[PDB]
Design an enzyme around this catalytic site. Structure first.
Site, PDB file in Angstrom:
ATOM      1  N   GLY A 289      -1.694  23.479  -6.687  1.00 41.36           N
ATOM      2  CA  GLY A 289      -1.641  25.365  -6.562  1.00 41.36           C
ATOM      3  C   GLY A 289      -2.531  26.421  -6.951  1.00 41.36           C
ATOM      4  O   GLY A 289      -2.573  27.162  -6.075  1.00 41.36           O
ATOM      5  N   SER A 290      -3.151  25.678  -8.336  1.00 35.86           N
ATOM      6  CA  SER A 290      -3.537  27.239  -8.855  1.00 35.86           C
ATOM      7  C   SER A 290      -5.123  27.439  -8.263  1.00 35.86           C
ATOM      8  O   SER A 290      -6.005  26.875  -8.369  1.00 35.86           O
ATOM      9  CB  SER A 290      -3.361  27.226  -9.969  1.00 35.86           C
ATOM     10  OG  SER A 290      -4.443  27.847 -10.642  1.00 35.86           O
ATOM     11  N   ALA A 291      -5.285  28.484  -7.278  1.00 37.41           N
ATOM     12  CA  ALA A 291      -6.172  29.070  -6.647  1.00 37.41           C
ATOM     13  C   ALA A 291      -7.341  28.884  -8.257  1.00 37.41           C
ATOM     14  O   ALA A 291      -8.560  28.570  -8.246  1.00 37.41           O
ATOM     15  CB  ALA A 291      -6.633  30.613  -6.183  1.00 37.41           C
TER      16      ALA A 291
ATOM     17  N   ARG B 146      -8.461  25.345  -8.546  1.00 40.77           N
ATOM     18  CA  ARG B 146      -9.069  24.342  -7.708  1.00 40.77           C
ATOM     19  C   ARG B 146     -10.950  25.433  -7.741  1.00 40.77           C
ATOM     20  O   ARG B 146     -11.317  24.743  -7.263  1.00 40.77           O
ATOM     21  CB  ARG B 146      -8.202  25.163  -6.496  1.00 40.77           C
ATOM     22  CG  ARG B 146      -7.507  24.281  -6.202  1.00 40.77           C
ATOM     23  CD  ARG B 146      -6.535  25.069  -4.731  1.00 40.77           C
ATOM     24  NE  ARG B 146      -5.881  26.009  -5.273  1.00 40.77           N
ATOM     25  CZ  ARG B 146      -5.549  27.326  -3.963  1.00 40.77           C
ATOM     26  NH1 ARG B 146      -6.730  27.344  -3.445  1.00 40.77           N
ATOM     27  NH2 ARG B 146      -4.741  28.015  -4.757  1.00 40.77           N
TER      28      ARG B 146
ATOM     29  N   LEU C 187      -2.568  21.854 -11.967  1.00 35.15           N
ATOM     30  CA  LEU C 187      -1.952  22.469 -11.405  1.00 35.15           C
ATOM     31  C   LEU C 187      -2.663  22.712  -9.828  1.00 35.15           C
ATOM     32  O   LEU C 187      -2.877  24.129  -9.512  1.00 35.15           O
ATOM     33  CB  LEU C 187      -0.679  23.205 -11.491  1.00 35.15           C
ATOM     34  CG  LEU C 187       0.734  23.218 -11.704  1.00 35.15           C
ATOM     35  CD1 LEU C 187       1.712  24.575 -12.263  1.00 35.15           C
ATOM     36  CD2 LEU C 187       1.659  21.799 -11.596  1.00 35.15           C
TER      37      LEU C 187
END
Ligand SMILES: N[C@H](CCC(=O)N[C@@H](CS)C(=O)NCC(=O)O)C(=O)O
Lengths: 203, 208
Positions: B8-10, B13, B6
């Protein structure tokens, strides 16, 4: 090499098992956190994160985080025994990825949720039992946590964590693979008796 | 390589930036969790060409360098120095990121944005989170990057993903001069920084 530690501490015990595995003798420097020894300027200058275990090597290199210490011990001292380093910390990218995955699982989930449940609750209990169920699943049909034919530093790290679960009072026999792995691994890893001994007497 | 993720997930990323760095193109597979779409259902999950399944972003990051970056020995050396001492600092920063920096972020903010949505932050959790930022600020004193070196390492990428999450949460990073300086400089130069910023914004959906 100076080793700033507390006897009952799981990450310290993980480092002590790893040092014994590579033939490294640690100069034990008991650092009493309740007495605030980790907050003295002498310690802060070594380790600004003021945490144990902290290792100071012969050239004054300072390292902390037990799992980074484990890897450093194998890479720098284990390397003199090629087969040994390979057993503890396999070099194949895939095999090593799994060892890393298990180390990160140990710090962020297995030991983390242990600390979440025991240091302050049905919620954090289910959270922790889930961690144990994950580990049990990792060990399905496998002798060691990251696979392999021999224990790796991942086994040594998780052995420290699981010995803490045991002394806490958790019924580990509930997780058939974890109990099995724990018994057999504790019987074969050098200094693993010191791990449980140290978990029991102090932790 | 399939990448179950996803934006949004650090952790997701951090892998995206690492893959960009080694020249790996990820086949992105959106795995919506709140819906329920690796026996730990961890995202990110990487599935390589042989069907080898890996989760844990930091293990993935290392695997990407070791397997997919190591053809360019100088590049792999930049991202993941092999000298035991240098590598040890990179490892400690990766462990710090997971167990201290992101962990304390989550412990402070998650109760306010998920589940019960506690109307106020725990002050003890806030103090603890600020302590983590202070540590990082300290690590960066007199240094360009989180683990040292003349170039960003994978530890910088992991922490960059975490710090961008601090930013969208509304934490004033300017309070930590070294962190802010490093965050600007690193965001300006690393491959896949655009994915990081774009994705962190997405995680801001929990902070409206
Ligand atoms: N990630 C852990 C860190 C362990 C840790 O934070 N140690 C505790 C005691 S077991 C400590 O030194 N707490 C004091 C402090 O951080 O200020 C590791 O494996 O080394």
């Amino acid at each position: 090499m100076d080793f700033y530690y507390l006897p009952g501490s799981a990450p310290c015990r993980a480092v002590q098992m790893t040092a014994a595995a590579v033939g490294v003798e640690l100069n034990l420097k008991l650092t009493n956190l309740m007495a605030g020894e980790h907050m003295k300027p002498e310690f802060l200058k070594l380790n600004p994160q003021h945490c144990i275990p902290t290792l100071v090597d012969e050239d004054g290199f300072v390292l902390w985080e037990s799992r980074a210490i484990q890897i450093y011990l194998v890479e720098k001292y284990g390397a003199h025994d090629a087969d040994l380093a390979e057993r503890l910390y396999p070099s194949d990218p895939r095999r090593r990825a799994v060892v890393h995955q298990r180390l990160f699982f140990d710090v962020a989930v297995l030991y983390q949720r242990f600390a979440e449940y025991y240091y302050p609750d049905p919620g954090r209990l289910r959270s922790m039992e889930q961690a144990l169920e994950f580990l049990n699943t990792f060990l399905e049909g496998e002798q060691y946590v990251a696979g392999g034919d021999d224990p790796t530093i991942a086994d040594l790290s998780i052995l420290a964590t699981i010995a803490t679960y045991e002394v806490a009072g958790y019924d580990l026999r509930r997780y058939e693979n974890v109990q099995r792995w724990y018994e057999r691994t504790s019987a074969i890893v050098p200094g693993a008796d010191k791990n449980v001994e140290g978990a029991k007497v102090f932790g």
